């Protein structure tokens, strides 16, 4: 959930859940960039222009 407390970690007895490298907001921004690029420019999105 990335908002967990450390009391859950001591409940786990040493097991921890590391947050992912990419935030869900950053994933949404990447998806938005992909959609805008493909709808506007077509396959020239991939070549770079």
């Amino acid at each position: 959930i990335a908002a967990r407390d450390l009391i859950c970690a001591q409940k786990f007895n040493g097991l921890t859940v590391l947050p992912p490298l990419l935030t869900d907001e950053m994933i949404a921004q990447y998806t938005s960039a992909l959609l805008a690029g493909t709808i506007t420019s077509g396959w020239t999105f991939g070549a770079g222009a």
Binding site: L34, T38, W43, F45
Partner: protein, 50 residues
């Protein structure tokens, strides 16, 4: 006695690791398929069938 208990706990952790191995293998297979679909079908047109 502590050797027996710690050996049991370490075996439990190692079995957890081998289960995570199955999970990571399946996840990497599906994610490589997803990366192939990202390379083909959204950035271009795919002549592949189904």
């Amino acid at each position: 006695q502590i050797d027996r208990l710690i050996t049991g706990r370490l075996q439990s952790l190692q079995t957890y690791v081998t289960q995570q191995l199955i999970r990571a293998a399946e996840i990497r297979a599906s994610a490589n398929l997803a990366a192939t679909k990202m390379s083909e079908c959204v950035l271009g047109q795919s002549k592949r069938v189904d």
